[PDB]
Structure 1
Amino acid sequence: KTVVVTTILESPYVMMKKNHEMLEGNERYEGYCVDLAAEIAKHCGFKYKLTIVGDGKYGARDADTKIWNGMVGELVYGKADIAIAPLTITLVREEVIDFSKPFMSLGISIMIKKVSPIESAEDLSKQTEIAYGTLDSGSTKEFFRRSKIAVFDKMWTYMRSAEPSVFVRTTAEGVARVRKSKGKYAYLLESTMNEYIEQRKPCDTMKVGGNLDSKGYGIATPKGSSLGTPVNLAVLKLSEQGVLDKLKNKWWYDKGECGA
């Protein structure tokens, strides 16, 4: 029984190689998540087929319709069996899907155009000269929406009532916007993606300040599935064997086409 593996096109997690037109099956995808899925399948011992989520959404709930979209939606509604992808572990997701142990620590970080005047998030909220937003229907926007801290509350209140739409549909759109804004825009995204972008050409983006919080990516399965314990054990074994460290070093720092 082939296991359906939903995932999203995120770099360096999943990429469509370079000559994908002449390739078929899972051989046309490469990245950290592809390697993670291969190791998970090797440990558990199942045949899998990588599938790309129909909409480029990680997963959230719509305007009071209680419907999950993106990867979480495909998991809940039975459209997929497992999600090896950068899915942040959150409160709202955990109640509906089974998350494994985190395979990568991360956090929310500020990235800007290349002594920065903002540095910390407090100064970023205080100064209204520079605009800042998040990814639409992701996890950072939900973190800001439900945040009770005064600084994050001010951040979310400004971001929601902003003209034009300060949010972006895809993280690539966000990095393009912050590159083209001539330093007038700040992008809020995961620390791992921030470091990957800052370690790539043309190296015009830099990460400033610290991490707003601490989160992690987990392998998600439908609630009440038989694969949750095996994939949890496989993630633990991979972490203890250094496989996750090796994969992150390969896909984040082995190439390093940046000047640092």
Structure 2
Amino acid sequence: KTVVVTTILESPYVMMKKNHEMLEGNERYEGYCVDLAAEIAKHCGFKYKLTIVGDGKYGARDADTKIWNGMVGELVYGKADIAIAPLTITLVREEVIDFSKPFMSLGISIMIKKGTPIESAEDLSKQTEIAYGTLDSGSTKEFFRRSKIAVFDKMWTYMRSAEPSVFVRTTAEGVARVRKSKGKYAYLLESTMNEYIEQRKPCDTMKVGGNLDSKGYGIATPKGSSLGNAVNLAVLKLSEQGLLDKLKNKWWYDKGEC
């Protein structure tokens, strides 16, 4: 049987290739997670089809219906067999799906347009001129929603009520908002994506401050899946081979333009 893999279009994890129109199936895509999927499948010995998550989301639980959306939902409701994406290992997700040991470390970070007078999260929290937000239906938004840290709690109070809305539907929308806003919008996103974007033309954004937290991405499977054990061992093996480091260099710094 062919394993259905859910993933998400997010650079440089999964991107449409330049010449995709004349390519078919898995071939249409390239990126870190596309390379990772291929080695996972080889080591675990399965065939697979990459599918882009229908609703374009990572995954959160609707507070009223309790229904999961995004890639998490696809796993939970049996629409996909595995998710290979920059999907953050969190407590609420671990309660409903299984994660491999992390294949990448990261933390929440701040993206500004170059020249913006912001140096830290505390800086953002102490002013009103510069608006800031995060991605909808992701782990970053939940981080701020839940934080008991005075700075982050204060930021959340501001974000949850801001007008117009400071939240975005995709990372691309967030980055575009930063770029178009003349330094009046800052974007809270994962350090991995931040570091990638900082090295791509037009080279007008910057990661500022340290990471706000430390966590990891994992490969996710439905709870009790026959795949979970093999996938976990494969991640550890690839880590120890140095393959994960190699892929990181290939997609982040070999592809730098600035």
Shorter-chain TM-score bucket reads over 0.9
Counting only pairs closer than 5 Å after superposition, residues 202-213 of structure 1 correspond to structure 2 as 202-213=202-213
Question: Structure 1 CA distance, aligned partners of 2:118 and 2:34?
Answer: 37
Question: Structure 2 CA distance, aligned partners of 1:195 and 1:240?
Answer: 24
What SS does the corresponding residue of 1:245 show, helix, strand or coil?
helix
Offset, 1:115: 7.4
Offset, 1:136: 0.9
The runs of at least 4 consecutive aligned structure 1 residues that moved more than 6 Å come to none
What SS does the corresponding residue of 1:210 show, helix, strand or coil?
coil
Match of 1:182?
182
Question: Structure 2 CA distance, aligned partners of 1:56 and 1:236?
Answer: 28
Match of 1:32?
32
Offset, 1:256: 1.1
Question: Structure 1 CA distance, aligned partners of 2:224 and 2:63?
Answer: 27
Offset, 1:20: 1.2
What SS does the corresponding residue of 2:42 show, helix, strand or coil?
helix
> What residue ranges of structure 2 are gaps of 5+ in the alignment?
none
* 1:174-220 Cα distance to aligned partner (Å, 9 max, x none): 11110111011100000000000000001000111110000111000
Offset, 1:117: 2.9
Contact 1:75 1:82 in 2 (8 A): yes
> What residue ranges of structure 1 are gaps of 5+ in the alignment?
none
Match of 1:95?
95
Contact 1:135 1:170 in 2 (8 A): yes
Contact 2:116 2:183 in 1 (8 A): no
Match of 1:49?
49
Offset, 1:116: 5.5
Offset, 1:31: 0.5
Please identify, of 119-128 and 7-16, the stretch whose mean Cα deviation from structure 2 is larger.
119-128
Offset, 1:19: 1.6
Question: Structure 2 CA distance, aligned partners of 1:201 and 1:76?
Answer: 38
* 1:218-253 Cα distance to aligned partner (Å, 9 max, x none): 000000111111000000000000000000000001
* 1:91-138 Cα distance to aligned partner (Å, 9 max, x none): 100000000010010010011011763211111101111110000111
Contact 1:116 1:208 in 2 (8 A): no
Offset, 1:149: 1.2
Contact 1:89 1:215 in 2 (8 A): yes
Contact 2:221 2:228 in 1 (8 A): yes
Question: Structure 1 CA distance, aligned partners of 2:95 and 2:57?
Answer: 19
Contact 2:178 2:185 in 1 (8 A): yes
TM-score by length of 2: 0.98
Offset, 1:25: 1.2
* 1:69-88 Cα distance to aligned partner (Å, 9 max, x none): 01000000010000010100
Contact 2:103 2:218 in 1 (8 A): yes
Contact 2:106 2:191 in 1 (8 A): yes
